[PDB]
Amino acid sequence: CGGERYLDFLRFAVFVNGESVEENANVVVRLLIRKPECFGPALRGEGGS
């Protein structure tokens, strides 16, 4: 519920402006993959997930 309360913000960063930008998206996904715990660790955990 917290992460769903988040990320509609980040969606709205890039949503209506169709096919949004890369200067934002690159840093977004880079910071995101650099912290894999921000994913569902049930999915993207440190091991079997």
Partner: protein
């Protein structure tokens, strides 16, 4: 002080597994496996670790904008935040990140290896510092650990203590990566660790050797010989000091080390009373196998204990040194035993080199460095033979065992690595192009003709 460019560097890291810290170096053979593997090095006092495949070297340390520019078409010092190109000094394959899975991580697993990836998309690796005490733009030093990330996969060079044993990849997260100055800019006409050469007794044509292969004597029986094996693989033997870092320092007179035979990968020693036996690389605990140099076989007090960190003093010239050696344990000096009847004397000229109690006053081993691809050849001999013998032995495991619909054999079947190695050797020994100019064609067919011959001095056919 710091790693200048066009230098020779090795990786080093640490990982405790047994509630005991363990120094894990990294290496990769090249031929037969594009993948890399780890290298424990902590046990140097009781076993020598392999110290050629780990050694890589530098080409260029630049900005990523400069990287993006050179992708679209001098001597320096390493800096943080720089991309870096590495070269595997043995196989000449540049080190990159790859697109393969292993250990069931089910992710961007990206099993690290090396290839001919001179195209700069993935062989480059972005440098960072390891801690907040350092920062970007700082001139990087020696001995500090580092965090290193790919350009193409932008994932940390990862040491995976996975569900299995310990493993390496660039899959998940950081690992502290050190850069030991394994070697540096050596000097002309001098020796360092890792070198290989022919060890010439006499003045004109006579040198060290070993028994030719396809012999039931196991080739533990060191001899001398004249001017035939002076162009073959047997008379080449590697050295390495007992250190890890700055192993490519210049080794001086009376300097301790081990000596490896390049082809068999075996070491020399006196175990109990068996003479100069060629010991394997497990029973090699730096007393039987530790040897030094001697200007003459006279008694010196043996008080040369003066540790060095840099390049050090060069002294040893090739052809003028005329070295001698005493075993550090027993003190006894190398000499031919001069055991030979009339039949063996008139027959095959073959002495028996032995650490004599005093020796003769004509040992005087002047030297001829070999600075050639043939070192690479001999390492390929060792790797290929070590693969094919265990391969055929695994074949012989089930040879007299027609299975049933069940467990078919015992051990695994080494298949993929040998296939890769086979096509690699095919590309290695392949002829030159007919369209080329005559001169280079002649030089290259000469080179492979030599290499064809060099694959019979250690058999490589039978």
């Amino acid at each position: 002080q710091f790693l200048r460019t066009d230098d020779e560097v090795v990786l080093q890291c640490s990982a405790t597994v047994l509630k005991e810290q363990l120094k894990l170096c990294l290496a990769a053979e090249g031929f037969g496996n594009r993948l890399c593997f780890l290298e424990p090095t902590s046990n140097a006092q009781n076993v020598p670790p392999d110290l050629a495949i780990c050694c890589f070297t530098l080409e260029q340390s630049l900005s990523v904008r400069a990287l993006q520019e050179m992708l679209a078409n001098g001597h320096r010092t390493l800096l943080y935040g720089h991309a870096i190109l590495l070269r595997h000094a043995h196989s000449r394959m540049y080190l990159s990140c790859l697109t393969t899975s292993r250990s069931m991580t089910d992710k961007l697993a990206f099993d690290v290896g090396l290839q001919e990836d001179a195209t700069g998309e993935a062989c480059w690796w972005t440098m960072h510092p390891a801690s907040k005490q350092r920062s970007e733009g700082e001139k990087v030093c020696v001995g500090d650990d580092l965090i290193l990330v790919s350009v193409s996969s932008e994932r940390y060079l990862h040491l995976s203590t996975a569900s299995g044993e310990l493993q390496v990849d660039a899959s998940f997260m950081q690992t502290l990566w050190n850069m030991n100055p394994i070697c540096s800019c050596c000097e002309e006409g001098y020796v360092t660790g890792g070198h290989v050469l022919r060890l010439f007794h006499g003045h004109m044509d006579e040198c060290l050797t070993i028994s030719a292969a396809d012999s039931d004597d196991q080739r533990r029986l060191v001899y001398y010989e004249g001017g035939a094996v002076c162009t073959h693989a047997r008379s080449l033997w590697r050295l390495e000091p007992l250190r890890i870092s700055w192993s490519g320092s210049h080794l001086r007179w009376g300097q301790p080390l081990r000596i490896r035979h390049v082809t068999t990968g075996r070491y020399l020693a006196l175990t109990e009373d068996q003479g100069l036996v060629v010991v394997d690389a497990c029973k090699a605990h730096t007393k039987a196998t530790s040897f030094c140099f001697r200007v003459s076989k006279e008694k010196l007090d043996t008080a040369p204990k003066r540790d060095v960190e840099g390049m050090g003093p060069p002294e040893i010239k090739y052809g003028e040194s005329l070295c001698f050696v005493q075993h550090v344990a027993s003190g006894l000096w190398l000499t031919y035993a001069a055991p030979d009847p009339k039949a063996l004397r008139l027959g095959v000229l073959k002495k028996k080199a032995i650490l004599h109690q005093e020796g003769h006053m004509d040992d005087a081993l002047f030297l001829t460095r070999c600075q050639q691809e043939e070192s690479q050849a001999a390492r390929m001999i060792h790797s290929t033979a070590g693969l094919y013998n265990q391969f055929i032995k695994g074949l012989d495991s089930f040879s007299g065992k027609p299975r049933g619909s069940g467990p078919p054999a015992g051990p695994a079947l080494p298949i993929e690595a040998v296939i890769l190695s086979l096509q690699d050797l095919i590309g290695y020994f392949e002829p030159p192009s007919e369209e080329l100019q005559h001169e280079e064609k002649q030089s290259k067919l000469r080179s492979l003709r030599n290499r064809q011959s060099l694959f019979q001095e250690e058999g490589m056919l039978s």
